[PDB]
Design a binder for this molecule. Structure first.
Ligand SMILES: CC(=O)c1ccc(N2CCN(C(=O)c3cccc(Cl)c3)CC2)cc1
Ligand SMILES: CC(=O)c1ccc(N2CCN(C(=O)c3cccc(Cl)c3)CC2)cc1
Ligand SMILES: *Cc1c(COP(=O)(O)O)cnc(C)c1O
Ligand SMILES: *Cc1c(COP(=O)(O)O)cnc(C)c1O
Lengths: 429, 429
């Protein structure tokens, strides 16, 4: 048992946080003591206050926290089987989830490799791509290509295809794999960009295993959106130049961009796809990498005879059980209407920010809203500003943004957008 | 789904650890329940109760559905499933961090939570690299280990796995080129440590860290080595200013007869990884600990922070069950328990030394290994053990167990008897 003060004292001495220091944090983290539906209970001035999780706790909480159907799914599974090793055993949760995932992802993705995080699923995707070409007698095809502005995780291979600036590649001189970067993909569709991407890919085609991109929305590398037609072009380019296409849908999956998967906006299927953040409805760490029958059969028929990967908690029954419930909950409702309403709410709520002096862009895509500013956002100023307004927001660089739970009512979206608009006002002020 | 429908879905759609799709020599066995030391598996359409001799890949130290652990999960679920760790902290994370800092080897003062062992290893390497970069020595970026090791399946993790066991031949030109000392022997030999030092001396200026599994090497061959080697590594690392990293992902939490395997030598590494048994085998969770000096040096460097932050970092649910698992272990006489277990394994496995296909029998804490003279055929071994009411999964030439700590003396003897019978069959053909 620990009080918030004790929690803070332990935390300051002993706990790392994402991309943080020990003993040099500008501001202490805020003690969270509960989470229910769209709301977090945080400690502020020693007292508990309920605030909207505008971030969906980093894209995860699509149905909100403590959804009764999802709580129930976990507890039912807990009474039967917590976990068994996936080496030599299988189980209902894994089979149920894999069937669901193959049915709902872009056509052709027939096999599912479960892992415990997005970064791992990305490494699995790369491993599938590299083993695929090795299975085709082309080990030279081992490099990856992407466009700038991307994020794919924090493990060392994932780092190599992250945006070179966002990813601080200059601090990793001589340690990361050297990958092929195309220029930042633009928002608006310009076939000249695709022509140039193709020309650059063409000269590297013989050394490229895959193009890896986030489809439609680039998250941690800058919350940038691009025309879905670029993905149609990528599919065509990759098809014609024999380079696998990998869509990283770890942030975009399960309805977030207004399609069940962002690939659906372009009506294209990748050869390999990663999913993760929202997969369990934000209960537990779980990710999946899917690939076509062709990819799976080629890997399986190659010299190695198997995909050389196998996490300890692969296909954990508890995480899989809650994921099944989470996906069924999404599919059993009119999610498409729900996201359209959310997008409309975000658009309407963020429209006034356009007029603000420090604001360069306002953009919405499905249940994602972004205010881009002309200068870095002071976090020591912004965080308490949104908290004071009943909203948990986490800006970074020049961006103030939200990816709210799908269960957010119109009143809650208004509340979120208001806080965002106000943080932007203080940036200019 | 019926067991048959599960098998059908599984065969078409599910990857398993280090497996193929469509080319599996045996179907996985359907698991329908797990309670205590026992799994309920479907065999010829009928449910059967068998002992989980593998602890579900080292995870289930307290057995499955332990009331204390089930309870810890459901009571955390009631309050907070998960919140983002960026800007927020919480009681489960603080309680676990406090516990971990106070039971791990002295000087390990900070804790980075992640979702899997492979990730925690990548975090450890990142800590070491950023440490040296913080000291103005970015040339110190390679890792050194001994052969026979396993550290996970992500690309950096792979680079320090045994090159043979990890099939580095398949990964030519993709993996970082690390420094490998020869396999560490079982018995203490001063010449081995002298040679290790001599090799390290040649690379000292380009080495960030030595990374080893202390005392027991797991997936690389279930080999044990004299703890005195760890005292040598510590001294070598100190004199040549190379960080020492212990991977205790398999060895942690009493498994080798000490609380952590480093304790067998009284040695403190600069950085430490834990994972498999961390949650008592309920959920995926791992941790990377480092000293105050490492933490401060990273935090004072150009990045001003450790450049890593998993989505489900410090998941409340996983942390809560981990707190309960660790407390459950510490609140009993675990040392006597493991000693009794080891004695049971030793007594039970002794008769195997006389079998024709057996080259070695070795026990270290709650780990029993029959080393055979040929690779073990799973198609024979699996059903043979199930026939005897035990779930065993041999690998390579090893018939081994790492049973739950809650196994009674009779259950241990039932496990060792099945192990003996499998070993007898291996040489029986
Ligand atoms: C779990 C959580 O709350 C969290 C918060 C921030 C996190 N970050 C900070 C912003 N990020 C980056 O600035 C970033 C880090 C590396 C590469 C790229 Cl392209 C971007 C991504 C990781 C990750 C997790
Ligand atoms: C979760 C589970 O049941 C499981 C079973 C076997 C697993 N492996 C991984 C390590 N194995 C290796 O052979 C291995 C794989 C890479 C490097 C090294 Cl040193 C060893 C055996 C199969 C992993 C997970
Ligand atoms: C967060 C993220 C990842 C990495 O996921 P983790 O679970 O944090 O390892 C990979 N790809 C994308 C697009 C992401 O947004
Ligand atoms: C299993 C293991 C790992 C990898 O853990 P995952 O959770 O499977 O990624 C790393 N190191 C050691 C010593 C292990 O036994």
């Amino acid at each position: 048992g620990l009080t918030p003060e004790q929690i803070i004292a332990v935390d300051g001495a002993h706990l790392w946080h994402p991309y943080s220091s020990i003993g040099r944090e500008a501001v202490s983290p805020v003690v969270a003591v509960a989470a229910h539906g769209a709301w977090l209970t945080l400690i502020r001035d020693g007292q508990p206050i309920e605030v909207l999780d505008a971030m969906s706790s980093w894209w995860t909480a699509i149905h909100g926290h403590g959804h009764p159907a999802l709580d129930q799914a976990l507890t039912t599974q807990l009474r039967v089987m917590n976990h068994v090793m996936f080496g030599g055993l299988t189980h209902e949760p894994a089979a149920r989830l894999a069937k669901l995932l193959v049915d709902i992802t872009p056509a052709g993705l027939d096999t599912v490799f479960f892992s415990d995080s997005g970064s791992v699923s990305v490494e699995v995707a790369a491993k599938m791509a590299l083993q695929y070409w090795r299975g085709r007698g082309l080990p030279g095809k081992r490099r990856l290509m992407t466009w700038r502005g991307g994020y794919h995780g924090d493990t060392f291979l994932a780092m190599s295809i992250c945006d070179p600036h966002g990813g601080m590649h200059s601090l990793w001189t001589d340690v990361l794999a050297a990958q092929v970067f195309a220029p930042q993909v633009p928002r608006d569709y310009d076939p000249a960009y695709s022509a140039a991407f193709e020309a650059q890919l063409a000269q590297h085609a013989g050394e490229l295993a895959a193009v890896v991109v986030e489809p439609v929305v680039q998250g941690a590398g800058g919350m940038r959106f691009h025309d879905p037609r670029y993905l149609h072009d990528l599919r065509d380019i990759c098809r014609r130049y024999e380079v696998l296409l990998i869509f990283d849908e770890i942030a975009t999956g399960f309805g977030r961009t207004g399609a069940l998967f962002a690939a659906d906006h372009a009506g294209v299927s990748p050869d390999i796809m990663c999913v993760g953040k929202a997969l369990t409805g934000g209960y537990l760490s779980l990710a999946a990498t899917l690939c076509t029958a062709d990819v799976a059969h080629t890997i399986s028929a190659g010299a190695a005879g198997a995909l050389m990967h196998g996490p300890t908690f692969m296909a954990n029954p508890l995480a899989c059980a809650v994921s099944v419930a989470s996906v069924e909950l999404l599919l059993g409702q009119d999610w498409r209407t729900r996201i359209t309403e959310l997008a409309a709410g975000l658009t309407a709520g963020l429209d006034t920010a356009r007029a603000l002096p420090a604001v360069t862009d306002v953009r919405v895509c499905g249940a994602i809203g972004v205010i881009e500013c002309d200068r870095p956002v002071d976090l020591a100023v912004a965080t308490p500003a949104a908290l004071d307004r009943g909203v948990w927001l986490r800006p970074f660089r020049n961006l103030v943004y939200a990816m709210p739970p799908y269960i957010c009512t119109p009143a809650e979206i208004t509340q979120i957008t208001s806080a965002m608009v106000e943080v932007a006002r203080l940036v200019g002020s």
